[PDB]
């Protein structure tokens, strides 16, 4: 029914992968141990699957995976979070990805979760990626109560790699978000954007640390962070940049605290009240719009 | 003046707005009559923006004399979406960006209660507005009105936003500028579209060539409303005076 | 001749104060201590210098600084430093600015330095601002070598407060610069900029740390920084932004490495070379075109 | 053709250029002759940018197939600088923007040798062009060429740079958008003064108004030059086709 990876509970469910695209999967009680290879000139344009249920109290989903891309591959690894229960939970994801010369390599994670908090969402991935090479990453958590979110990614880029990074949130009530990337340019014209996008309601806590390193000729790079205030929420946005090289370019542009007055002014112009207009902007902000 | 004051839509009498230490606007009397497309026409730096703004209330935009009144109503202590709500509504000239809001979303809002009401019709009426502002539906309904988009796609967006408001006074602040336009003959479509409608159009252009389009022309120079009244005579007065 | 306070060495060498604005001076022995105080009501115009030459090797001019403006004050100082001999020396100010309510402080500190980079100057000011204050911040140092520059800025602000703080610097030889600036709006309508401006070149080293709390409703900062890099120089920019109202906003734009494209393109479109052009947009950017 | 090339100051000949998988112009012939006011009209997205950015040889604009000559030789293999050092300029519509430049030292920048030789001449100059672009030069001499100007002050100040410059060939990408304009007469006092001189203008323009002025104009549709020759011709068959 498509290469697919389910894991719900603690537990490995399923494992199938097709031809030129390997897929290893172990259990070391609690752990798993997961190995996706795709195979040199296997270019699937078909996503692959990546499911995560958690409906049980005190669940620890640690994964260890490994994805390796060889040359001139390409996959799109689409990763659904659906914790509706949310008591006890904690899903950790350490992650080692390698990106082969001239590979490709997509991931998108979704979650859905309930109204509790109780849930411990940490990903940690360390991405390598080699000349003419490509990483897309996106996480979306705008459903239901986030918890703890944690993440942490740091991208090593040769020549000609191209990075696209995207974060998605929605902090509610007690939540706490911590994101903490870092890319290192580290090859000639190797390209990269990091963009968060957000909005913190009630009493929520975000910390948003982004860098990158131009440390190659012809190497760019761009932050673009924008995250909307509310009710008692308090946000901290870190972006460091270091440059390394004279035909190096990084450029950085944040927005944080409350919403565009032109913006609102333009809703509001449409009749839209103030909360109608601020509620559209965080909408269209999170991605529901 | 209180003679004819049942026809007036709009009525700007004896403005002064001041930006700071400096005052912009030094005394406008401006009105609007129902059904009227009235244009502004000044130089650069005359006040045409700051005017536009205060009439729609924007914030910092604070009349220090004089009275805008909207449908018999001195709209003095009426924020923005109260002003929006007896049906006037502004163009900007560079329409906000938007992060996430789709353009079939965005000319949802504001929306008139004539089309709003009915899901087939309002859909309809977003078409027919994307269409007249010469932007293929199909391509732009699920294209965010975002930093992507051009600026005259944007500019035409808003446009279409017009249209679908259709409200009873519409203040356009340069539409003929930002799209670029080939021919007047585009714009003219659109604007006796929503003159057909029952809506009132206060155009504010610095182009003597599209006030002549309109009804009646006032020329607003340093802040103050010099000649008003046909749009060639006014016109010709513009060519030469500043 | 004029309200100046001169500092020849490590010795002062003069303290005279007008009416309205005292002028206190004394030294415990290599260590000057001053207090200017601007009575209330004292609007001058017309700006107070304030002289620091070294032309002696191995001077460390320590300067403890009292700066109070009292209600309804206002004062503008002009501090010019002149080290051409640069073996040795050692420029170091510490200073405590209390701005009272509705008074206006100005401050714009210039260097005019040798080529001998053995020079340290290290700025350290804690900055309060009551109710409807002003406080204007320059310092420049983009002639000769700089040597280490350590400039060190906390200012804390109240209700109606607004603050300008800028920086251009022009780093040559094996230079080092460090810029620490917080600024913490704490009241009602606070407002903020702090601007920094520079190039970098040959084997310099720059690290600036800028950062805003938005701890008030409608409390308003930006953070504008750009940095040319050139050479084998280092640059390191991290503007934190913390919000902790739901009416605060900040903003940051930075731009760090190379030239932008489109500059440097216009310029060779009048006929300068690559280096005529870049030059030119250096040039501007230390504020010497 | 190589029939009247003694006369030709610019010659695109069947340019192809790519911007990634999309191909902008698909086979661009346009020449530029000396002492000629030549616009280049189009509709939105037809490539007028992209030809102008191709000739000046901005970073990117690399042509795929086709040559452009100036002045006899093909420039192909010329930068930028080495373009402008043969007597080309180019506007942009969107000047940049420069930090700390003010507008007597920019205005000197690629001044033409008959002025920028003799001090008191080059200072004249630069006072004649800000005269001549509607500007006080009292009022901006001692201002930065940065975002403190507004859109029209800027693009008035890039005019004035044109005029300094006073090019063998000025492109000039949209001369009359961004500064407002309130009479076509202020912009052909301009482009006559530089015709006078001995200039050749390649005005790209989207208001078929503005091409009336030219001696000849060339219309571009989705990257191709669809018609040419005399202004109100070329600009009958705009009306229609598209
Ligand atoms: N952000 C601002 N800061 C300072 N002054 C401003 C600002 N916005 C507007 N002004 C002032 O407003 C006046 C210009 O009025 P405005 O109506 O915006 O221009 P205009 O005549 O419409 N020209 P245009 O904007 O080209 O259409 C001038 O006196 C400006 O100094
Ligand atoms: N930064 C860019 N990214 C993608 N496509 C671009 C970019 N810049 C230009 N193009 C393409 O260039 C073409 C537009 O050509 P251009 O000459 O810039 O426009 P134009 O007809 O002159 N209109 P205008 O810019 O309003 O004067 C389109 O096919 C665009 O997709
Ligand atoms: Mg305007
Ligand atoms: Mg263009």
């Known amino acids: 029914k498509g290469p697919r990876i389910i894991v719900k509970e603690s537990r490995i469910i399923d494992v199938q992968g097709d031809e030129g695209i390997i897929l290893e999967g172990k259990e070391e009680d609690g752990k798993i141990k997961a190995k996706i290879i795709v195979k040199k000139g296997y270019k699937f344009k078909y996503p692959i699957h990546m499911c995560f249920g958690i409906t049980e109290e005190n669940i620890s989903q640690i994964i260890d995976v490994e994805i390796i891309l060889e040359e001139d591959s390409s996959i799109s690894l689409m990763s659904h979070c659906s914790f509706p229960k949310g008591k006890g939970i904690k899903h950790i994801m350490n992650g080692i990805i390698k990106i082969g010369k001239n590979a490709k390599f997509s991931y998108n994670e979704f979650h859905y979760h309930g109204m509790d908090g109780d849930i411990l969402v940490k990903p940690t991935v360390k991405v390598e990626i080699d000349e003419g090479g490509i990483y897309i990453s996106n996480f979306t958590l705008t459903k239901g109560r986030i918890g703890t979110l944690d993440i942490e990614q740091e991208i090593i880029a040769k020549k000609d790699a191209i990075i696209d990074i995207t974060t998605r949130t929605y902090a509610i009530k007690e939540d706490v978000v911590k994101v903490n990337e870092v890319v290192k340019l580290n090859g000639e014209n190797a390209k990269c954007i990091i963009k968060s996008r957000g909005a913190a309601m009630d009493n929520s806590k975000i910390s948003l640390k982004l860098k990158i390193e131009g440390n190659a000729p012809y190497s760019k790079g761009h932050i673009d962070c924008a995250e909307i205030v509310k009710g008692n929420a308090e946000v901290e946005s870190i972006p460091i940049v270091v440059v390394r090289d004279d035909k190096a370019r990084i450029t950085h542009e944040a927005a944080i605290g409350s919403v565009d007055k032109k913006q609102l002014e333009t809703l509001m112009a449409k009749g839209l009240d103030e909360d109608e207009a601020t509620e559209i902007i965080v909408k269209g902000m999170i991605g529901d719009l | ?242």
Chains 1, 3 share one sequence.
């Not at chain 2, 914030?59 to 006037?88: L, Q």
Request: aromatic share 6%; hydrophobic share 35%.
């Open chain 2, 1 to 242: 003046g209180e003679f004819m004051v049942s026809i007036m839509l709009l009525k700007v009498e004896d403005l002064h707005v001041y930006r700071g230490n400096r005052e912009i606007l030094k005394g406008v009397n401006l009105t609007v009559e129902e059904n009227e497309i009235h244009a502004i026409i000044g130089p650069n730096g005359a006040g045409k923006s700051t005017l536009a703004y205060t009439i729609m209330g924007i914030s910092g935009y604070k009349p220090t004399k004089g009275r805008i009144i909207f449908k018999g109503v001195d709209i003095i202590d009426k924020n923005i979406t109260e002003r929006a709500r007896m049906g006037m509504t502004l163009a900007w000239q560079e329409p906000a960006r938007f992060e996430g809001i789709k353009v079939k979303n965005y000319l949802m809002l504001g929306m008139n209660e004539k089309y709003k009401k009915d899901k087939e019709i309002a859909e309809e009426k977003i078409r027919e507005a994307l269409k007249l502002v010469n932007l293929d539906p199909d391509k732009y309904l699920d294209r965010y009105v975002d930093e992507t988009l051009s600026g005259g796609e944007r500019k035409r967006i808003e446009l279409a936003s017009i249209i679908c408001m259709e409200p009873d006074l519409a203040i356009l602040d340069e539409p003929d500028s930002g799209i670029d336009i080939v021919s007047f003959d585009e714009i003219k479509r659109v604007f006796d579209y929503l003159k057909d409608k029952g809506c009132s159009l206060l155009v504010i252009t610095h182009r003597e060539e599209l006030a002549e389009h309109a009804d009646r022309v006032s020329l607003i120079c340093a802040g103050e409303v010099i000649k008003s009244g046909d749009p060639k005579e006014v016109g010709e007065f513009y060519k030469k005076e500043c």
